[PDB]
Amino acid sequence: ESTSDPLAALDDAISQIDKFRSSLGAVQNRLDSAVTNLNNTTTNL
Amino acid sequence: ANRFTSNIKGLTQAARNANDGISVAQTTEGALSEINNNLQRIRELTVQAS
């Protein structure tokens, strides 16, 4: 029994993967901003 | 960009499929012409038979 809507399901899976990647890249940038904060504040301290 | 790539690959594959379909149609029309020649010959010689 073939899938009823193959292409739609594939598109939804790809969208889910891309959403996870976007959420993960956001936290990448977030941690890097934290790293910049850390050295900047430790030099002043 | 991912969504554009999806459409790009799908459209390339669909174009190849459409080329295969037009090949099918060409083959069928050639067969029909080969039949029609003999059918017209049958008509012509039936006119003589009349």
Curated annotation (Swiss-Prot), chain B:
Subcellular location: Secreted; Bacterial flagellum
Coiled-coil annotated spans: none
Superkingdom in the source lineage: Bacteria
Extent of the signal sequence: none
Membership in a protein family: Belongs to the bacterial flagellin family.
Purpose: Flagellin is the subunit protein which polymerizes to form the filaments of bacterial flagella.
Protein name: Flagellin
Organism of origin: Escherichia coli O127:H6 (strain E2348/69 / EPEC)
Upper taxonomic lineage: Bacteria, Pseudomonadati, Pseudomonadota, Gammaproteobacteria, Enterobacterales
Residues of the full protein shown: 51 to 100 of 548
